[PDB]
């Protein structure tokens, strides 16, 4: 099924041609527009007040990472090495040697942010939900270095968006 | 990003050399060292206009080649995202046409709505743009409780938001002698140029892909397309309005009977164990381990099958090697095939009225130089 | 929306049409931003039986 | 004393171009679901001066190709000529009660083509000297229009001169008696305004030209009432309605698209011209078939 | 929502009001009340001339009547 | 917050004049945003840290910094790992 | 004092500088949506001061949105030589900040820095438009803290 758009046969009666001749005349079409357009000025706008108010997101959204850790603090990373076998811009670098305990777990984690794609593929990938998405989005940095991630860094933004982070992850386990 | 080089004989033009590449990245390449999974956003990158829509090409031609068919309700989910980017980019196509003539309140009225299906777009997936939402084997995620409702507040109130980008272009003279008899093409230089979509539709040509080979679960909804007579950048510019009233119909077709059951195929060996069978199952640990590490092994062959994307029919050629990777994909896309009669297309117009047909072929910087 | 009746049918005229029917920004009537958890339906092959992956 | 006078014309004007940049941006504001400037100041009141205030703090980049000549003295004239403009308009009691007003508001007039040709011509550069090409070709096209206007007007006001204009009216607003010229004139002051480093001050002639136009007609169609002991009601009066038509300028600049430079030809030369010939030939006509020519003195 | 724009205008509303205003007082101030007597014409002139040439202050804008003769 | 105003300008903040040692005043961002309350400000959960608070971790930060670029106190980014390889040395034996 | 009037001056010259600075685009890639979806309703930047445009004579800020190809190398460096002093740039996206997703494909140089001396660095792919407007946000703080008449004075 389809319809026509363009198509209008005019009539050419004396009432119709008055009525397109009197538009173009005296324009009508025109001040249509400047009717609509005041209409619209009297109308309150959808600005925001930025930053003392910001738009809205969702329990899902993707942004700053954060390396997060168990109830008693210990690192959820295992280096199972799951998130960069899966990260699309290969953005995660990860060693792991052994550590004190006669533990193995892991040294670095870079997630370069001038090579990731907030995909989320490495937080889907992870197991342990060991790196996640977090919620922040204000880090933006004039130097090129600072968003070169280390294992410091995404250890601090963990232990930094902590209880957003946590109480999503928990109004979210259900839907992934 | 356009090179547009040019000649003026006078004010006249007599032809125009559309130096694309100019965001040339050889995104083909580059998934010839992924695997499919790694390479689903790299399509979400392509036409970052209508995106949704090119994650449903290259799902179905995964799905095609792994003789696995969608779950019936992810079906259903990907053409309300479908139509989405249908209205997400005929929003952008109109109004940036509209921009590039000199009209600016169109511009912003839809402009302001694009960020409501931007902010649905937020809550299925979590991004405003670039979701990576549609997968081989239907969805990621399940729609977030309430989202049905609100889309439908939003589409309850879409309509009349049309009304005025009708209202002050389509009966304003001034959008009309900036947009009428310009761009003409006749139906077999349409059709033979390899052009798709709407200079098919808009030339007179009866022909569409989400009617003639109707993909995914189109079957059941029902719409018209619109057709029209002259199919110059003004008769385009119509069906690019009438699809977007079209878009909210097949919105609402699928929204009031949206089926129940899962969003993924049950086929762990194509899609990820869910997180709380992955943490009990011994079986989806290994699955989902391998399926993160190699992925799916995609047995081989090749298709090409297409989806009538917005831009038009927008396609994509891989070839499997029997892996887990791609070999090649071939990144079909309408706006190469739409820039390709641009030489033609702005033949017989000065620059005033061929930057409108610029505007009316869709094109964007991605499909072509990928 | 706020806007007294004054403001409504000036704009109304203006327009021609009923703006205050349908507005372009949101109101209360939205879903919560917080809701109820979900309970996703169980897999289509779920069965523990007669679910060889060889059919 | 005179010279009080004369800045007393200027510095207000220039404080008030100041702020119609803050007014071009706000009231398309709020008629685009945006706010305007509202950041800077008390609902962008700074805004005016902070546009003014950061454009002369920036180097003047200059081409080499430009000559440094041309490149300063087209715009230099593009205000002084537009400056001039402002003086013989009828407030209460104008400037200079120039006998021929009329001709020396158009003839100014006709000199704001020499800031866009010459500041076209000396950028010797291709996108330049097109566009410089384009606007000279538009407002000279638009000039015959102008003049063939307010020879039909004017005829039923006495003489040229301006401060004749409100006696005319007086009891009844000119544009009842010349509506079919009214839109025939808004139209056209809408073309000439080119409005459908050394910048803010060209910006601010612009813009002052867009002020000083909608008075004209203010002064021309929108009549009002003088009283010779309260000129004071006659000033408010004039503000308003040159604000108001100011306002419409901002009021069109967002609600239509661009013309096509051939369809801007053809407006003009083939339905405005032999349009604005026949109502001259009516303006002409009548006041003679009806008794109703006004003194010219 | 749009009250905003008041203070956007008013400004230059006042600001577009001072000429205005500025001639109408000085000319008062300069001429005495009076208007500048308007000179279109060589007539109306050389009224002026005759008046600033009676007045004997050399001033057009001082005006003497009946009481002038006796 | 607010009801009566629309989805999108129904929550919103006045910053403090002193936070962190840093000076809030006439300059101000949207990082002063502590992150328990990112959430409700946020319109990512009706329910706000009023009420029911958050979960209480020993390892939490005791206080939400601001972003510290263009600071003294910056990020700067350097390898984690550990030297790999290490060179022979060289006995300082007397010789010979 | 000798100080406090230049310290006054010093503000006065940049405070607003902060405030009318107006961006300039390029627009390359899906960076470009945001690059002016931020100049629709929702996100105002048009009341931040700030309005897009192109005018490369006369602007102050370009945000760089997009991937940098090698192919199109020469028009940006053509375009900041053409920008005006004072003049800053902004790198908007994962890829032109860094590479990004193709920072391993051949025809995109890997970061705008390498191009470009380039200014606050705000992620994002895309960066969700109010992330930039945070990062112009920093970028306006940023002016604050400069001592150019200071300089001036102490040398
Ligand atoms: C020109 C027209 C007359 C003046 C403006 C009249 C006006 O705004 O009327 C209110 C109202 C504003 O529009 P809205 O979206 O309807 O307002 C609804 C809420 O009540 C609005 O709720 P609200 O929360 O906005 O109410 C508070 C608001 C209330 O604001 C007012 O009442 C406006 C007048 C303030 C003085 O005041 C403020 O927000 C404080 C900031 C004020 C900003 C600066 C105002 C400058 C006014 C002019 C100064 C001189 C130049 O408009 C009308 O009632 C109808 C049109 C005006 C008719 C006037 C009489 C003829
Ligand atoms: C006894 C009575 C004697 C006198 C009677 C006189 C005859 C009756 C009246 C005649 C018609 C009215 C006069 C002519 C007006 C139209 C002229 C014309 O060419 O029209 C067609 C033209 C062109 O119409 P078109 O594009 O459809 O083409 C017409 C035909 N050709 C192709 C030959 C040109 O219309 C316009 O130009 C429209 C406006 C374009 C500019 C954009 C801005 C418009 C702003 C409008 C709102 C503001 C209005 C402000 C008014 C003043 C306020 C102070
Ligand atoms: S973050 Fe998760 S997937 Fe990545 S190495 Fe650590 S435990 Fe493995
Ligand atoms: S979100 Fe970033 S780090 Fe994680 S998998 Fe995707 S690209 Fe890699
Ligand atoms: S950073 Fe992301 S959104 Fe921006 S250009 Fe690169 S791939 Fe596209």
Not at chain 4, 199 to 218: H, P, Q
Not at chain 5, 5 to 30: E, N, Q, R, S, Y
Request: glycine share 6%.
């Amino acid at each position: 099924t389809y319809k026509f758009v363009n198509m209008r046969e005019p009539s050419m009666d004396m009432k119709s041609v008055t009525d397109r001749a009197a538009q173009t005349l005296l324009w009508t079409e025109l001040v249509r527009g400047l009717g609509m357009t005041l209409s619209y000025l009297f109308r309150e706008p959808a600005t925001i007040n930025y930053p003392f108010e910001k738009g809205p997101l969702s329990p899902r959204f993707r942004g700053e990472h954060a390396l997060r850790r168990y109830p008693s603090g210990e690192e959820r990373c295992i280096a199972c090495k799951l998130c960069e076998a899966v990260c699309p811009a290969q953005a995660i670098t990860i060693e792991a040697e052994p550590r004190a305990d006669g533990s193995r777990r892991t040294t670095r984690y870079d997630i370069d942010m001038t090579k990731c794609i907030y995909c989320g593929f490495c937080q889907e990938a992870c197991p342990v939900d060991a790196i996640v998405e977090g919620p922040n989005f204000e880090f933006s940095t004039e130097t090129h270095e600072e968003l070169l991630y280390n294992k410091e860094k995404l250890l601090n933004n963990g232990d930094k968006w902590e209880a957003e982070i946590a109480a999503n992850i928990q109004a979210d386990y259900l839907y992934r | 990003v356009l090179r547009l080089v040019m000649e003026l004989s006078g004010e006249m033009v007599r032809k125009c050399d559309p130096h694309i590449g100019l965001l040339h990245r050889g995104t083909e390449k580059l998934i010839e060292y992924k695997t499919y999974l790694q390479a689903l956003p790299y399509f979400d990158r392509l036409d970052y206009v209508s995106m949704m829509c090119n994650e449903q090409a290259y799902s179905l031609a995964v799905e095609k080649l792994l003789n696995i068919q969608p779950p019936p309700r992810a079906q259903w989910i990907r053409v309300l995202f479908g139509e989405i980017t249908r209205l997400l980019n005929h929003i952008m196509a109109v109004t940036t046409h509209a921009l590039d003539i000199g009209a600016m309140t169109p511009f912003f009225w839809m402009f302001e709505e694009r960020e409501k299906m931007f902010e649905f777009y937020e809550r299925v997936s979590g991004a405003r743009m670039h979701a990576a939402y549609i997968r081989p084997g239907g969805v990621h995620q399940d729609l977030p409780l309430g989202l049905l409702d609100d889309i439908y507040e939003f589409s309850k109130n879409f309509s009349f938001r049309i009304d005025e980008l009708e209202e002050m272009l389509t009966n304003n003279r001034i959008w009309r002698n900036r947009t009428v008899d310009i761009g003409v093409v006749t139906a077999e230089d349409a059709l033979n140029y390899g052009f798709s979509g709407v200079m098919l539709r808009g030339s007179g040509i009866q022909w569409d892909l989400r009617k003639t080979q109707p993909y995914d679960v189109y079957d059941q909804v029902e719409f018209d397309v619109p057709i029209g007579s002259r199919g110059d950048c003004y008769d385009r510019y119509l069906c690019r309005v009438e699809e977007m009233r079209q878009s909210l119909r097949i919105i609402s077709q699928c929204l009031n009977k949206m089926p129940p059951g899962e969003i993924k195929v049950d086929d762990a060996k194509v899609s990820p164990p869910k997180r709380a069978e992955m943490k009990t199952s011994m079986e989806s640990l290994i699955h989902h381990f391998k399926l993160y590490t190699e992925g799916y092994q995609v047995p081989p062959g090749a298709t090409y099958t297409a989806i009538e994307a917005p831009k038009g029919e927008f396609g994509v050629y891989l070839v499997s090697d029997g892996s887990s990777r791609p070999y090649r994909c071939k990144i079909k896309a309408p706006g190469f095939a739409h820039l390709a009669g641009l030489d033609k297309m702005s033949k017989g117009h000065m620059l005033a009225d061929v930057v409108a047909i610029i505007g009316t072929q869709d094109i964007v910087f991605g499909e072509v130089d990928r | 929306a706020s806007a007294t009746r004054v403001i409504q049918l000036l704009r109304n005229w203006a327009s021609g049409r009923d703006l205050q029917a349908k507005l372009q920004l949101r109101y209360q009537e939205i879903s919560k931003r917080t809701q109820p958890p979900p309970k996703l339906p169980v897999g289509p092959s779920h069965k523990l039986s007669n679910n060889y992956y060889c059919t | 004393m005179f010279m009080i006078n004369i800045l007393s014309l200027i510095i207000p004007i220039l404080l008030a171009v100041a702020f119609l940049t803050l007014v071009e941006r706000k009231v398309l504001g709020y008629m685009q679901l945006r706010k305007g400037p509202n950041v800077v100041g008390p609902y962008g009141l700074l805004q005016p001066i902070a546009d003014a205030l950061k454009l002369v703090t920036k180097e003047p980049l200059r081409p080499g190709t430009s000559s440094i000549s041309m490149f300063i003295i087209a715009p230099i004239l593009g205000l002084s000529l537009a400056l001039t403009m402002w003086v013989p308009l009828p407030m209460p009691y104008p400037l200079i009660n120039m006998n021929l007003g009329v001709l020396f508001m158009l003839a100014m007039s006709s000199l704001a083509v020499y800031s866009i040709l010459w500041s076209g011509w000396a950028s010797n550069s291709k996108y330049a000297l097109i566009g410089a090409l384009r606007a000279v070709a538009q407002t000279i096209s638009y000039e015959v229009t102008l003049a063939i206007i307010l020879l039909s007007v004017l005829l039923m006001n006495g003489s040229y001169t301006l401060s004749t204009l409100i006696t005319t009216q007086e009891h009844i607003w000119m544009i009842f008696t010349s509506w079919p010229l009214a839109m025939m004139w808004f139209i056209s002051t809408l073309a000439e305004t080119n409005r459908a480093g050394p910048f803010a001050m060209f910006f601010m002639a612009e813009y002052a030209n867009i002020i000083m136009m909608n008075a004209f007609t203010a002064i021309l169609f929108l009549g009002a009432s003088h009283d010779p002991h309260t000129p004071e009601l006659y000033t408010i009066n004039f503000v308003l309605k040159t604000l108001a038509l100011t306002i419409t300028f901002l009021w069109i600049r967002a609600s239509y698209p661009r013309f096509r430079y051939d369809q801007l030809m053809h407006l003009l030369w083939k339905s405005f011209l032999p349009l604005t010939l026949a109502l001259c030939m009516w303006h002409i006509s009548l006041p003679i078939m009806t008794a109703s020519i006004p003194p010219q003195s | 929502m749009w009250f905003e724009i008041l203070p956007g205008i008013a400004v230059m509303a006042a600001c577009l009001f001072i000429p205005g205003m500025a001639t109408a007082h000085i000319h008062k101030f300069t001429n005495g009340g009076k208007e500048k007597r308007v000179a279109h014409f060589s007539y109306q002139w050389n009224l002026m001339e005759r008046d600033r040439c009676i007045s004997g202050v050399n001033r057009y804008h001082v005006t003497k009547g009946l009481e002038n003769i006796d | 917050e607010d009801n009566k105003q629309f989805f999108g300008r129904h929550r919103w903040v006045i910053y403090t004049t002193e936070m962190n040692g840093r000076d809030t005043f006439w300059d101000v961002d949207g990082s002063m945003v502590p992150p328990e309350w990112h959430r409700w400000l946020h319109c990512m959960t009706d329910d706000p840290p009023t009420t029911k608070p958050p979960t209480a971790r020993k390892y939490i930060w005791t206080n939400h910094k601001f972003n510290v670029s263009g600071t003294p106190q910056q990020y700067v980014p350097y390898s984690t790992t550990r030297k790999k390889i290490q060179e022979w040395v060289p006995p300082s034996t007397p010789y010979k | 004092r000798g100080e406090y009037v230049v310290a006054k001056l010093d503000d006065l010259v940049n405070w607003a500088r902060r405030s009318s600075l107006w961006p300039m685009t390029f627009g390359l890639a899906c960076c470009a949506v945001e690059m002016m979806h931020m100049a629709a309703p929702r996100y105002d930047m048009d009341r931040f001061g700030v309005v897009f445009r192109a005018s490369p004579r006369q602007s102050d800020v370009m945000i760089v949105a997009g991937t940098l190809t090698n192919k199109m190398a020469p028009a940006l460096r053509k375009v900041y030589d053409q920008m005006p002093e004072p003049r800053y740039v902004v790198s908007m996206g994962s890829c032109a900040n860094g590479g990004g997703y193709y920072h391993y494909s051949y025809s995109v140089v890997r970061g705008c820095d390498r191009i470009v001396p380039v200014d606050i660095y705000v992620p994002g792919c895309p960066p969700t438009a109010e992330a930039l407007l945070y990062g112009i946000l920093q970028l306006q703080r940023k002016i604050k803290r400069e001592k150019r008449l200071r300089i001036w004075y102490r040398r």
